[PDB]
């Protein structure tokens, strides 16, 4: 059901691939086309192998060469594509942890939308790479019940789908309606436990029960909102549908004045092998154009070409 848009290339020769990229860059001048045609059509594990082979051939590090050879957004994209899947979310989290200038958007997006499995892998990749504990660094660079919600979620311990108890559904719906009357400023532990810990299917029932109880959907309570409110929205939307949430994220990365390339790159690279196909379907369903068409319009050059190759779905 969950389908990315990049898969293992058939008849893969890592050595041949290394020589293509070498021909593309050796000398003054650069063949961005050959580079982006190659790497956007190889899976991430194949890219790591291509990098290995490149080093043995040329004696040179592949990513460093592409850092000097390439420029701007296109460089940032290619270098993102070269990060191993296993470390990519751990890296984007580190990049976003900066004490005062901490990038909450990224923390929220990743933690609210990743599965239990994905979180404990991220938590392990993060300690190996950076020699510190993800939860502690998060705690040290965040505050309030935003921090609390995050730590809870980082416990990667959500309830599994079981049999539905409508009485319990009645109570939580009632508890979240009341928490929302109090503007998410009281007994925060309670609604954190409900939203951060109860099962996916339980909570989808809760959202409907809530709408009966209140007249409005739970999203309409939150949206000029704080960090904690953005997290509740991200968690709620991720509960309803992860690809929808991530389609929405892509949309706002582009809808305004310029482009939030940081987000565009991250969502495409990190989702390219999990559920980007599903993301395209939600984006078309909910925003009335292909994801392809919005990339085409908001991006240019080789950067755009690579992004469209990764994504696909022109005739969506
Ligand atoms: Ca060159
Ligand atoms: Ca980043
Ligand atoms: Ca724009």
């Amino acid at each position: 059901a969950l389908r990315g848009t990049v898969t293992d290339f058939s008849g893969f020769d890592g050595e041949a691939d290394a020589e293509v990229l070498r021909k593309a860059m050796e000398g003054l001048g650069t063949d961005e086309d050959s580079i982006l045609n190659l790497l956007t059509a190889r899976s991430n594990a194949q890219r790591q192998q291509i990098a290995e082979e490149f080093e043995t051939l040329f004696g040179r590090d592949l990513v460093n060469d592409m850092k000097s050879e390439l420029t701007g957004k296109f460089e940032k994209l290619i270098v993102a594509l070269m990060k191993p899947s296993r470390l990519y979310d751990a890296y984007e989290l580190k990049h976003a942890l900066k004490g005062a200038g901490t990038d909450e958007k990224v923390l929220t997006e990743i933690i609210a939308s990743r599965t239990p499995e994905e979180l404990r892998a991220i938590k392990q990749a993060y300690e190996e790479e950076y020699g510190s504990n993800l939860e502690d660094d998060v705690v040290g660079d965040t505050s309030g019940y935003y921090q609390e919600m995050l730590v809870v979620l980082l416990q990667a311990n959500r309830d599994p789908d079981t049999a539905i108890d409508d009485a319990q559904v009645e109570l939580d719906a009632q508890a979240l309606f009341q928490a929302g009357e109090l503007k998410w400023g009281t007994d925060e532990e309670e609604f954190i436990t409900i939203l951060g810990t109860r099962s996916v299917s339980h909570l989808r029932r809760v959202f409907d029960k809530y709408m009966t109880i209140s007249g409005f959907q739970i999203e309409e309570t939150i949206d000029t909102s704080g960090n904690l409110e953005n997290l509740l929205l991200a968690v709620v939307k991720s509960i309803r549908s992860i690809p929808a949430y991530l389609a929405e994220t892509l949309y706002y990365a582009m809808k305004g004045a310029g482009t939030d390339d940081h987000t565009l790159i991250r969502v495409i690279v990190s989702r390219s092998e999990i559920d980007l196909f599903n993301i395209r379907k939600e984006f078309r369903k909910n925003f009335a154009t292909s994801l392809y068409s919005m990339i085409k319009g908001d991006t240019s050059g080789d950067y755009k070409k690579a992004l469209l190759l990764l994504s696909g779905g022109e005739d969506d």
Side-chain angles (χ1 to χ4, degrees), residues 1-21 24-25 27-57 59-161 163-188 190-208 210-215 217-254 256-280 282-316:
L2 268 47
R3 196 216 288 190
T5 59
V6 168
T7 68
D8 282 358
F9 190 61
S10 295
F12 165 69
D13 194 339
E15 200 186 352
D17 282 353
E19 271 139 26
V20 166
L21 295 179
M25 295 186 290
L28 318 103
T30 307
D31 192 348
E32 291 86 9
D33 248 316
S34 168
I35 282 159
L36 69 80
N37 288 334
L38 196 150
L39 295 171
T40 55
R42 302 290 177 286
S43 79
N44 185 273
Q46 295 176 330
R47 290 186 210 119
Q48 301 323 303
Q49 294 167 230
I50 294 159
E52 254 201 72
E53 297 279 7
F54 182 87
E55 196 145 333
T56 79
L57 182 81
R60 234 177 304 119
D61 180 81
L62 176 52
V63 166
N64 275 354
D65 275 19
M66 290 187 305
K67 280 177 180 283
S68 48
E69 284 288 305
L70 303 184
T71 296
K73 292 171 202 320
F74 180 60
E75 182 198 321
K76 294 197 194 203
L77 181 54
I78 296 302
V79 171
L81 252 12
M82 293 307 297
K83 267 301 208 307
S85 293
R86 207 184 71 79
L87 306 178
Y88 188 57
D89 287 0
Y91 164 91
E92 282 291 271
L93 286 173
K94 241 299 187 186
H95 189 223
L97 293 166
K98 288 184 277 155
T102 284
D103 191 354
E104 294 94 356
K105 286 172 197 78
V106 183
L107 296 185
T108 288
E109 168 182 311
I110 295 178
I111 294 157
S113 74
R114 275 38 167 176
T115 66
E117 285 96 323
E118 287 175 329
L119 287 167
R120 69 182 59 107
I122 287 159
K123 268 195 286 193
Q124 194 196 105
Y126 188 105
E127 139 69 43
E128 292 165 0
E129 288 302 300
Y130 308 111
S132 38
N133 206 273
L134 169 55
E135 177 177 318
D136 311 356
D137 298 331
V138 169
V139 161
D141 292 335
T142 63
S143 88
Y145 280 102
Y146 172 52
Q147 167 197 290
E148 289 313 293
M149 244 284 175
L150 289 179
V151 167
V152 166
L153 291 162
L154 275 177
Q155 303 316 305
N157 210 293
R158 194 175 283 277
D159 284 4
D161 286 32
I164 301 289
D165 174 358
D166 302 304
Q168 191 52 232
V169 164
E170 186 57 38
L171 289 185
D172 297 342
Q174 208 72 241
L176 298 174
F177 167 63
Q178 278 138 226
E181 293 301 86
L182 274 332
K183 294 162 179 185
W184 317 103
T186 306
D187 297 315
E188 293 92 323
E190 212 219 328
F191 71 72
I192 285 183
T193 303
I194 293 168
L195 268 346
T197 264
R198 301 268 199 281
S199 83
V200 168
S201 61
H202 173 72
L203 289 176
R204 288 190 201 159
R205 194 94 166 153
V206 169
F207 302 165
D208 290 330
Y210 183 94
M211 196 269 193
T212 315
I213 271 163
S214 87
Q217 295 290 171
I218 193 173
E219 285 80 351
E220 282 151 49
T221 307
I222 286 91
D223 270 338
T224 70
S225 69
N227 285 359
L228 178 49
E229 289 92 330
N230 291 341
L231 215 216
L232 300 174
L233 273 187
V235 162
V236 161
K237 287 173 182 167
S238 291
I239 285 285
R240 290 191 194 281
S241 165
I242 291 168
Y245 166 55
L246 292 168
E248 187 156 89
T249 299
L250 278 165
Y251 177 73
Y252 289 106
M254 290 184 283
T259 306
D260 182 8
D261 300 293
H262 199 219
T263 298
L264 219 199
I265 290 174
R266 173 180 59 257
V267 176
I268 303 287
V269 173
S270 69
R271 291 280 126 175
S272 63
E273 292 179 30
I274 297 161
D275 68 355
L276 189 54
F277 177 81
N278 318 70
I279 292 165
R280 279 163 40 194
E282 295 301 327
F283 191 100
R284 183 57 191 74
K285 195 216 286 281
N286 301 147
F287 301 105
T289 352
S290 57
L291 170 62
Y292 194 101
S293 67
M294 204 168 192
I295 292 167
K296 169 148 72 188
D298 255 56
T299 68
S300 75
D302 304 296
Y303 176 48
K304 175 184 77 225
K305 187 152 184 202
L307 251 22
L308 300 168
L309 258 15
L310 258 14
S311 156
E314 166 158 57
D315 303 311
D316 278 341

